[PDB]
A paper describes a structure:
After extensive calculations with the whole molecule and separate domains, the two CDs (N49–C244) could confidently be placed, rebuilt and refined, as well as the respective PPs (defined for E22–K48). The intervening residues are included in a ‘PP motif’ found in astacins, F35-E-G-D-I39 in pLAST.
The astacins are a family of metallopeptidases that share a central ∼200-residue catalytic domain (CD), which is found in >1000 species across holozoans and, sporadically, bacteria. The short paralogue has the basic domain architecture of the family, while the long paralogue further contains an LNK and an MAM domain. Here, we crystallized the zymogen of the long paralogue, hereafter referred to as pLAST-MAM, and solved its crystal structure.
Residue numbers in the entry: 22 to 403
C-alpha cells in the first residue's frame, strides 16, 4: 500500500526527492527561479545502471508524449543541457532545467510508472501539490504525526503566485504525496483530505497524469491546438499609370518608344501607354514588356487590358503570354477606332507569366495611335 513510496523520501533531500535545493529553502523563491526546457525538448542519457530498466523509463516518458507537447530525445552531439538518469538511493530529480548535465535518480523500487512520471515531473518544472499556497482549503496537516526533523517538507507557499493558482487543487495529482508521507511510525497520517470520502493514496500506483496534471504541463509549455487564421487572398493586380510606370519596360533595338503619357483618346482623359506617329515621321514598332506575375496556386488565371487603336498607320497589335515558350493569345489587324477590353483566360503550369504588347505603325498610310490602359491580372477564370 504505502511502502511503495518509501524511495521518494530521502533524509538529505528537499521534500524527500528534490535535489539541488537546500532543505530549509524559501519555497516561494525556488519556484520562481524554475527554468523550463526550450521547445519542450528534454534531452537525456542513461547511465549503465539505468539501462537495465530502460523499458520502464520509456513507459513514463510515453505518458508525456501521448498527452503533452514534451519530447524526450536522446542526447546527441552539441547538446549541453540534458538529464543523465542513474540508479542512486531512491527516486529524485532536480526541479527544471539546470544548465549542463543534470542528474535524475531512478533507484531500487523506482520502476513504477507513477514514480517515473513523478520524478520526470520535477525534471520538466513541477513542484509538490501538498504545499501550494491554497492547500489548507483541501488538506489538513497533522503536524503531530510527522517526524520533527521532517516538518519543513510540509511548509506551504505564501500567497502571491502571480495571477493566482490557475489549475485547481487536484487530489489525483501524481505530484501529490499520499496520506502517510514522512510518517513517524509508518501508518499514522501526516495529511488528511478535507473533502468527504476522498483518499489521495500512494504515487507508485497512480497510472501517470490525472486530467489537471496534463493541463498544467500544456499551459507551462504552451502546448495547444488553436489553429492560426486563414491566409489573406492573393491581391489581384491593376495598373493605372497615373503616378508610375508599373514596371512595364520597352525592348532596346526597336523603332518606336511606348511612353507613359497623359492625354485624351476615344472617350477617356487620363494616363495610358501611347505610341503615336505623324505622316512626316518614320516606321515605329514597339514591344511593351510587362513584369513577371506568379499564380501562387494551381489555378487558371485571367489577364485584362483595354486597347486603343486608331488611324490608318496602325498595321498590327499583338498580345502574347510567355511562360517557358512564347504563346500568342491575341492578334488585332483591324483598327477598332475605339477602346476594347481584351479578355484572355489562361492556364498555369507552375512558372511566372509576363506579357508582351507589340504594335506596328507605318506613317506611310497616315497618322496612327496605339494606346494601352487598365492592365489587370486575376488568378481566377476570366
Ligand atoms: Mg527529506
Ligand atoms: Zn517529488
Amino acid at each position: 500500500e504505502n511502502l511503495g513510496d518509501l524511495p521518494l523520501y530521502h533524509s538529505n533531500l528537499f521534500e524527500g526527492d528534490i535535489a539541488g535545493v537546500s532543505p530549509y529553502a524559501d519555497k516561494n523563491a525556488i519556484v520562481d527561479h524554475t527554468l523550463l526546457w526550450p521547445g519542450g525538448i528534454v534531452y537525456y542519457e542513461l547511465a549503465p545502471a539505468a539501462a537495465s530498466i530502460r523499458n520502464q523509463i520509456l513507459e513514463g516518458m510515453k505518458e508525456y508524449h501521448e498527452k503533452t507537447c514534451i519530447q524526450f530525445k536522446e542526447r546527441t552531439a552539441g547538446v549541453k543541457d540534458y538529464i543523465r538518469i542513474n540508479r542512486y538511493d531512491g527516486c529524485w530529480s532536480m526541479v527544471g532545467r539546470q544548465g549542463g548535465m543534470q542528474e535524475l535518480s531512478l533507484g531500487y523500487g523506482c520502476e513504477w510508472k507513477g514514480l517515473v512520471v513523478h520524478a520526470l515531473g520535477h525534471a520538466v518544472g513541477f513542484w509538490h501539490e501538498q504545499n501550494r499556497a491554497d492547500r489548507d482549503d483541501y488538506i489538513e496537516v497533522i503536524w503531530d504525526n510527522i517526524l520533527q526533523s521532517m516538518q519543513y517538507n510540509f511548509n506551504k507557499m505564501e500567497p502571491w503566485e502571480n495571477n493566482y493558482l490557475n489549475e485547481r487543487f487536484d487530489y489525483k495529482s501524481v505530484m501529490l504525496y499520499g496520506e502517510t508521507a514522512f510518517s513517524k511510525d509508518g501508518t499514522s497520517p501526516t495529511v488528511r483530505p478535507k473533502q468527504p470520502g476522498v483518499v489521495i493514496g500512494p504515487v507508485w500506483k497512480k497510472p501517470g497524469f490525472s486530467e489537471s496534471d496534463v493541463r498544467r504541463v500544456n499551459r507551462l509549455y504552451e502546448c495547444f491546438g488553436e489553429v492560426r487564421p486563414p491566409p489573406p487572398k492573393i491581391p489581384d493586380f491593376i495598373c493605372d499609370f497615373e503616378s508610375n510606370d508599373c514596371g512595364l519596360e520597352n525592348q532596346v533595338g526597336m523603332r518606336g518608344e511606348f511612353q507613359r503619357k497623359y492625354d485624351t483618346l476615344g472617350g477617356r482623359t487620363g494616363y495610358f501607354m501611347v505610341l503615336s506617329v505623324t505622316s512626316s515621321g518614320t516606321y515605329a514598332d514597339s514591344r511593351l514588356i510587362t513584369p513577371y506575375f506568379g499564380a501562387y496556386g494551381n489555378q487558371d488565371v485571367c489577364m485584362s487590358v483595354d486597347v486603343y487603336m486608331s488611324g490608318p498607320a496602325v498595321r498590327d497589335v499583338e498580345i502574347s503570354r510567355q511562360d517557358s515558350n512564347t504563346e500568342s493569345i491575341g492578334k488585332y489587324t483591324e483598327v477598332s477606332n475605339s477602346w476594347v477590353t481584351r479578355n484572355f483566360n489562361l492556364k498555369a503550369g507552375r512558372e511566372d507569366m509576363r506579357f508582351f504588347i507589340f504594335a506596328a505603325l507605318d506613317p506611310y498610310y497616315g497618322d496612327g495611335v496605339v494606346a494601352v490602359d487598365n492592365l489587370k491580372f486575376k488568378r481566377k477564370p476570366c
